[PDB]
Write a protein that binds this DNA or RNA. Structure first.
Ligand SMILES: [Mg+2]
Ligand SMILES: [Mg+2]
Ligand SMILES: [Mg+2]
Ligand SMILES: [Mg+2]
Ligand SMILES: [Mg+2]
Ligand SMILES: [Mg+2]
Ligand SMILES: [Mg+2]
Ligand SMILES: [Mg+2]
Ligand SMILES: [Mg+2]
Ligand SMILES: [Mg+2]
Ligand SMILES: [Mg+2]
Ligand SMILES: [Mg+2]
Ligand SMILES: [Mg+2]
Ligand SMILES: [Mg+2]
Ligand SMILES: [Mg+2]
Ligand SMILES: [Mg+2]
Ligand SMILES: [Mg+2]
Ligand SMILES: [Mg+2]
Ligand SMILES: [Mg+2]
Ligand SMILES: [Mg+2]
Ligand SMILES: [Mg+2]
Ligand SMILES: [Mg+2]
Ligand SMILES: [Mg+2]
Ligand SMILES: [Mg+2]
Ligand SMILES: [Mg+2]
Ligand SMILES: [Mg+2]
Ligand SMILES: [Mg+2]
Ligand SMILES: [Mg+2]
Ligand SMILES: [Mg+2]
Ligand SMILES: [Mg+2]
Ligand SMILES: [Mg+2]
Ligand SMILES: [Mg+2]
Ligand SMILES: [Mg+2]
Ligand SMILES: [Mg+2]
Ligand SMILES: [Mg+2]
Ligand SMILES: [Mg+2]
Ligand SMILES: [Mg+2]
Ligand SMILES: [Mg+2]
Ligand SMILES: [Mg+2]
Ligand SMILES: [Mg+2]
Lengths: 129, 144, 150
RNA sequence: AGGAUAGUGGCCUACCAUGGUUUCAACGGGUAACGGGGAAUAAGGGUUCGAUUCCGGAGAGGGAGCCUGAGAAACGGCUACCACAUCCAAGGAAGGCAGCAGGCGCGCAAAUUACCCAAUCCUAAUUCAGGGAGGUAGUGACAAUAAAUAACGAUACAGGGCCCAUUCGGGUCUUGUAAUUGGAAUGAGUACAAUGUAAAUACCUUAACGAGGAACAAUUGGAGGGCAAGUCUGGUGCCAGCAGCCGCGGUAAUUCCAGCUCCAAUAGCGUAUAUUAAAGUUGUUGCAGUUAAAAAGCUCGUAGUUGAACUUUGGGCCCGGUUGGCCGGUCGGAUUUCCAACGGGGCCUUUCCUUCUGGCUAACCUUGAGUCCUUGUGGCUCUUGGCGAACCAGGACUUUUACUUUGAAAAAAUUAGAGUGUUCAAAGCAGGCGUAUUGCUCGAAUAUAUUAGCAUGGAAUAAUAGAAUAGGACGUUUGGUUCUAUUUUGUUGGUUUCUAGGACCAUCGUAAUGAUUAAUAGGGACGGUCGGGGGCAUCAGUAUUCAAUUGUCAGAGGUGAAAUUCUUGGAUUUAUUGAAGACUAACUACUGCGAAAGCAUUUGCCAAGGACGUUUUCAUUAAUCAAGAACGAAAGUUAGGGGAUCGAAGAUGAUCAGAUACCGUCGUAGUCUUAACCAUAAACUAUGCCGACUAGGGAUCGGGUGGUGUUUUUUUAAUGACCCACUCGGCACCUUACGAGAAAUCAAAGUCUUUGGGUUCUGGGGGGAGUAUGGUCGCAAGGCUGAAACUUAAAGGAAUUG
RNA sequence: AGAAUUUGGACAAACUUGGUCAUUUAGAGGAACUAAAAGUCGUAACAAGGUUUCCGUAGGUGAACCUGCGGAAGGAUCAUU
C-alpha cells in the first residue's frame, strides 16, 4: 500500500521532469509535501504549484521550470546529528556548491544550509538538485 | 524496496541476515569453524617440523611431464603424514631419510601448487640448515 | 487490494464535494432521524437504512442531512446491536459455509474459503476489541457461533 | 518470622504462596574468550585484532578449609586430601618460579644463573635499613628514527654553439668515457683524556693512528605476461628443473642450469601463515535472484517490520548579535539605523505562561513639586493608597515516548593537534632571555572520545492520551459529610464553636458544551450480472472391448519390410441387440474461471467468488509476513469397489555384432472410484507480494454509461443481438525504445553510482552433494532440515564467425 | 587458666561405582568420491546426435541407460478466420 506520500510525490515530479513535462499532478498532498515543495520553490527548482481541494486529502499541480535534475526521498527518515549532515551532503549531492539536503527539525522542515546557520538538526527527508 | 527491510527499527533483522549469510564466505566459515586448528596438517601454524619417512617421485600433472621429487614427512607435533616438495635442481640429495625438515605451506593457502598433485608443503630447512644455503653451497649439513 | 484475493477493482461510491446538501431536500433532520429510528425498529441494519433512505427518499447522506452517521444515531436511540454489522455478516457467512461443509466433506475449496472468511472474522474482531466495541476476551469460537448470528 | 553477616538480600532455616525466564533467542553448546583504555587497515561506512607497559578481575600444581590480622578465604601463611616430587642412617623430615635469573620439556616460536639502590617510588620504630619493585648493562635485523659505502680536479673523444668553426683553432667550456692520473675530505675502526655513570659500557667531545682495488669490495630478488628489467652467449633436450596464476622445458629455451648485461627495493630484501585493503566477491551506505548461483508449488497467518490524510496558519510591531561602506584629515586598512543579508527574543492580532500562601515594590498602568541645556522624538529629583506578576520553597500539579540542540561526563597513555632547532627525525616536555654581579620569564594547550545515564532548549517528524450510557471541564455560587490544624482560650491534656486548609458528594450557574475526513486504502451490505471456480446428484453421447444373434467366404492383423497371432470348427468384414468401464471429440480461440494444483455432456440442489454499479454502512479495521496451518498434477502406498481402454513389470516376434532398447502382438500393477496416506514436478511467466509513476495502438472477455444508430419479433415499441463512443476490471497482443540490460531481450526486466516507497524468501566459483550425520514427518517409497574432509582454474551465461 | 582426648553440626577435599555430555581414535569387511594421460565394454548426451531433450515418480537392465504416467520447451512449431 501507499507508505510514503512524499516518496510518491517526488517520484511523480522526477518522472515528469525527466520526460520534459512542464507540469505534474500529485496525490494525496500532505503538508510535509507542501513544505518540501516550498523549499524547492524558494531555491528555484520548481515553479508555482497549486493545491486542489477535494474534501479528502487534496491534490497538487506543480509547475516545472526544467532546472530540477533529481528530487528524492531518504527512507527511513534517519536521525541526523549536526556533525553528520556533511556526510549526507557528500553522499547525496553532486557538488559542494549547489544542491540541498532537506531535513525536518523541531525548528521546521528546511534545507541543510538553513540547518547549518540555525544550528539545528533532526531527521532527513530528502534531497534536491 | 528491492528486498531487504528499510525500517528505522529493522536493525535486528539486518544484523541477523548478515550473520546468516556470512556462512557463505570461505574465510568466515573456516575461521568460525576453527578448521585450521581442527582439520589441517599444521594446526593453524605457518611452519612445522617433521621427520623424512621416504623419498617420493611424484609424476607431475599433464600437460607437464616430470618427476617432482617430494618427501613423505611425519610431523613431530601431530604425527600426521604430509607430502612436501623439495625445491631446486637437486636438493633431494640433501634431504635423505630420517632427517628432520622444516616445512612450510607454498602460498596457495592449501590448494596444491602448479603441476604437483596433492603436495601442499615445501621443505625449507633440513637438519637445521637452509635448503637454499645447501643448494648455493653457503653451508654444509652436520654429519655428526 | 482485495485482502483475500488477487482482485484490484476500484468500484466505490464518489460522495459529492458538498457537505451541506442538496438544495432540493425540504425535509427536516429530525424527520430523517425518526425515519431512521423506525427502520431500526423494523430490524434494519444501518447499511439497509441508508440504502432505503437514498432510494425511496431523497436522503443523499444521512450524516449530511442529519448531524451525524446512522450507526451513531441508532446507538444514541438505544438501537445498537450486540456486535457490529460487518462482523455479524462475516459470522453469518462463516456459519453458512460451515453448514455446507458438514454435508460436503470433499468440497475442499469451500474449506479453503471458510479459512479465508474466518481469517477475516478474526482480524475484524481483533480491531473491534482494540477500539473497545467488543468486550476483551470476546472470541469467535466457531462451535457455538450460530448463537450470535442465527 | 528467625538465624547468620560488617551490613541488605533465599545468604540460610521454619512455615506459607506458585511463582520466575523465554522466538525482543530463555535454557543449553562452542570459544584456537580475561574485560576495557586501545591496535592494524581503512575515501566514507566498515573488517580484524587487543595473552602483553595503564585501569578492573582472577590465580598461584588441583580442590577445599582456616589462623593472625583494619584488611587475606593469603599460598616466598598454615591444615588436609589428590597429583607430582626431595632428603633419609628407613626412624623420619621437608616441598610449590603464572616473582628475577636460570634449567628441562614443548614446540615455527621468545635473551644474563650479570651490576646497583644513583634515579622512580614503596615499606618499617624509619633522613640512615631494605626493596630481582625498579634502574643499569648483557643477548637481541620484533618494530621504529636518522643515514657511510665517496667527493672534486687535470689528460683523452662528445659536440648545441659564432666570423658561412673556412676543414677543427679563437682562452669553446668537459654533463658522459680513458681497471688512467692529482692532491684534498671524512668517519667505520683504534685509543691519551675528559665527559658520561652508583661504578662502569656506550653515546656526545677529543690528542695521536686510520682508503687507493679508497679488498674499508651491499645485499636480496628478479629480466615471457601480470610487472620494472635480454629473444645475448654456453649447457640440457617433456629430463633436470622452473612456474602464486597464465604457462616454460620434447635440439635457436628471452621462463630451467650458468656467464655477461639489465631492472627493482636497498642495510635491507625474500619465503610461509594469518589478517586488513583491493571485496559493490557480505552489500546500512552498497550486491545479485527471466536465462550466469539464487522467487518457497500455492494461499492463510502469529511474533517482526511497515502503515493514507487532517488540528496556529498568516500578517504586524519592538528589542536585537554579526561584514563592510566611505576622517580614509594614519601615504587600498577604525567609525557608524546609509543600511542590506543572516540569527535569537518579546508582544498584538479570539492566543495557558496551572497553582494558593509572601518578601520582588514594573524598561512605573496613572507625572502633587520641578521642562536653570538660544528650537531636537539618542541624559533627571523625597513619587497621587502606587495589576508589589523583573525568583526564592511547599500545591484544589502534573499525558507518556522517540528524535534533535547545548552543557557536563566519558582516568592517564594512545589518536588528531598547539608550542618548542631532541644538530635532523622518531621522540621528549621541555625550554627561552639577561645585566650569568647575586635571576627574570613563557609552557606543559586544544579537539575527538560515539551507546546508556544526567541537566537543558526545540516542538517539525513518528507514535501515544483525552469529553460518547458524559462518571466532561470551567466556578464568582449554595449545601452536606469526613479529615487535619497554629494563634489562643486561663496555664497544662482532652470535648468543642467560628475561622483555616485536603478530599468526596449533593444542586445552581456558565458554555458555540463535547464525535476530524471519507483515502481512485481496506472490510461489510445491496443490485443486476458473469464464469469449462467447487461439492452432491442426475442425464446424454458416440467410441473401445466383449457377448449373443446375423449373412457371405479365404484370408485377417501388423510393418519400412516382415514375423508373432486369429482363421472352412468361419477369422477379418456386414447387420440387429445388449453389457461394462472409462472419456467428454468437433464447437475449442494468443478466449473464460480458479490461490495454485487445476477446471469442457445436460439438468437440479448447496454454499462460495471476482469485476462492475452505488450521493449505502464501518472508519484505518491495512501491506508483507518467522513460527504456525489449509490446499497441492502425475507417479506411488493401504483397504474396499471397479477393472472397457491403454499399459512401468513380464512374455513374445522382429532388427542388429549384440538389443535385456526403439518397432509388432499380448499382458500384471496402474489407469477409474470410495476411505485414508504421500507432499513432490521444467509445480515455469524459470520473473515474490503490496503501492505510485513513465508511450503510442488496435483487438478481446465481464460490468456500466450515452446515441431522436441497425435488426428481428405486432411493421418499428422495448428486451435481445449487433454498431459506434466512452469508462472500470481482466487474459493477452502489436509498434517504438524513451529507459534498462552482457546480450537475448524487457512497458517491465523502466523510474539504479543522479545508488533509499513498504515487506518476505533465496544466492555468494566449479565439484564433493542435496552426499554423510543428527533431528523430524511418513506404513513405505521417501520428504523437510542439512555439513565437512577432500578436490579443482575454471565451470557457466549471452551473442559472433566458422 | 588449661593441653591430650572428645559429642553433635555446618563447610567439605578426596576416592569407588554408576550415569551422562564432549572431543579424539583402532577396526575385518562394505560402499562412495576424487585425482591420476594415453586400460576394457558399449555410444547415453551435443545435429531431428540418428527413439527430440529434460523434470517428478515408479519399475527394469552389464553400463551408459530403457520404459510407462503426468509436466516443461531450455524444441525440431511463436503460424490455418
Ligand atoms: Mg527480507
Ligand atoms: Mg490479496
Ligand atoms: Mg495480506
Ligand atoms: Mg487500487
Ligand atoms: Mg530478614
Ligand atoms: Mg582461555
Ligand atoms: Mg581485551
Ligand atoms: Mg587483555
Ligand atoms: Mg592464553
Ligand atoms: Mg589471590
Ligand atoms: Mg606450573
Ligand atoms: Mg590459600
Ligand atoms: Mg613462590
Ligand atoms: Mg605473594
Ligand atoms: Mg623466570
Ligand atoms: Mg623470535
Ligand atoms: Mg632507590
Ligand atoms: Mg662495504
Ligand atoms: Mg637467466
Ligand atoms: Mg616490462
Ligand atoms: Mg570499498
Ligand atoms: Mg556478486
Ligand atoms: Mg539459474
Ligand atoms: Mg501449486
Ligand atoms: Mg514459483
Ligand atoms: Mg503518516
Ligand atoms: Mg621532531
Ligand atoms: Mg473509501
Ligand atoms: Mg462436447
Ligand atoms: Mg467461454
Ligand atoms: Mg513456515
Ligand atoms: Mg523443488
Ligand atoms: Mg523455482
Ligand atoms: Mg481474463
Ligand atoms: Mg564468494
Ligand atoms: Mg558454490
Ligand atoms: Mg536418449
Ligand atoms: Mg547417441
Ligand atoms: Mg537420442
Ligand atoms: Mg541451466
Amino acid at each position: 500500500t501507499r507508505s510514503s506520500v512524499l516518496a510518491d510525490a517526488l517520484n511523480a515530479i522526477n518522472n515528469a521532469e525527466k520526460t520534459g513535462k512542464r507540469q505534474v499532478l500529485i496525490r494525496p498532498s500532505s503538508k510535509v509535501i507542501i513544505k518540501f515543495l516550498q523549499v524547492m520553490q524558494k531555491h528555484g527548482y520548481i515553479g508555482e504549484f497549486e493545491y486542489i481541494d477535494d474534501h479528502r486529502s487534496g491534490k497538487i499541480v506543480v509547475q516545472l521550470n526544467g532546472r530540477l535534475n533529481k528530487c528524492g526521498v531518504i527512507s527511513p527518515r534517519f536521525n541526523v546529528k549536526i556533525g553528520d549532515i556533511e556526510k549526507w551532503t557528500a553522499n547525496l549531492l553532486p557538488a559542494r556548491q549547489f544542491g540541498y539536503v532537506i531535513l525536518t527539525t523541531s525548528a521546521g522542515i528546511m534545507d541543510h544550509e538553513e540547518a547549518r546557520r540555525k544550528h539545528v538538526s533532526g531527521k532527513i527527508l530528502g534531497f534536491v538538485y | 524496496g528491492k528486498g531487504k527491510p528499510r525500517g528505522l527499527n529493522s536493525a535486528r533483522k539486518l544484523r541477523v541476515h548478515r550473520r546468516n549469510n556470512r556462512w557463505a564466505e570461505n574465510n568466515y566459515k573456516k575461521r568460525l569453524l576453527g578448521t585450521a586448528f581442527k582439520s589441517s596438517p599444521f594446526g593453524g601454524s605457518s611452519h612445522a617440523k617433521g621427520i623424512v619417512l621416504e623419498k617420493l617421485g611424484i609424476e607431475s600433472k599433464q600437460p607437464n611431464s616430470a618427476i617432482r621429487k617430494c618427501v613423505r614427512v611425519q610431523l613431530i607435533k601431530n604425527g600426521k603424514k604430509v607430502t612436501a616438495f623439495v625445491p631446486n635442481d637437486g636438493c633431494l640429495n640433501f634431504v635423505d631419510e630420517n632427517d628432520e625438515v622444516l616445512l612450510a605451506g607454498f602460498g596457495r593457502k592449501g590448494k596444491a601448487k602448479g603441476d604437483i598433485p596433492g603436495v601442499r608443503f615445501k621443505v625449507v630447512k633440513v637438519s637445521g640448515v637452509s635448503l637454499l644455503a645447501l643448494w648455493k653451497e653457503k653451508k654444509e649439513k652436520p654429519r655428526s | 487490494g482485495r485482502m483475500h484475493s488477487a482482485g484490484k477493482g476500484i468500484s466505490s461510491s464518489a460522495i459529492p464535494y458538498s457537505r451541506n446538501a442538496p438544495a432540493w431536500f425540504k425535509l427536516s433532520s429530525e424527520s430523517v432521524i425518526e425515519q431512521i429510528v423506525k427502520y431500526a425498529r423494523k430490524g434494519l441494519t444501518p447499511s439497509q437504512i441508508g440504502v432505503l433512505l437514498r432510494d425511496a427518499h431523497g436522503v443523499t447522506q444521512a450524516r449530511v442531512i442529519t448531524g451525524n452517521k446512522i450507526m451513531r444515531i441508532l446507538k444514541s436511540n438505544g438501537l445498537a446491536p450486540e456486535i457490529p454489522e460487518d462482523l455479524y455478516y462475516l459470522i453469518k457467512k462463516a456459519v453458512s459455509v460451515r453448514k455446507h461443509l458438514e454435508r460436503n466433506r470433499k468440497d475442499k475449496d469451500a474449506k479453503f474459503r471458510l479459512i479465508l472468511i474466518e481469517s477475516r472474522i478474526h482480524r475484524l474482531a481483533r480491531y473491534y476489541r482494540t477500539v473497545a466495541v467488543l468486550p476483551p476476551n470476546w472470541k469467535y469460537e466457531s462451535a457455538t457461533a450460530s448463537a450470535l448470528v442465527n
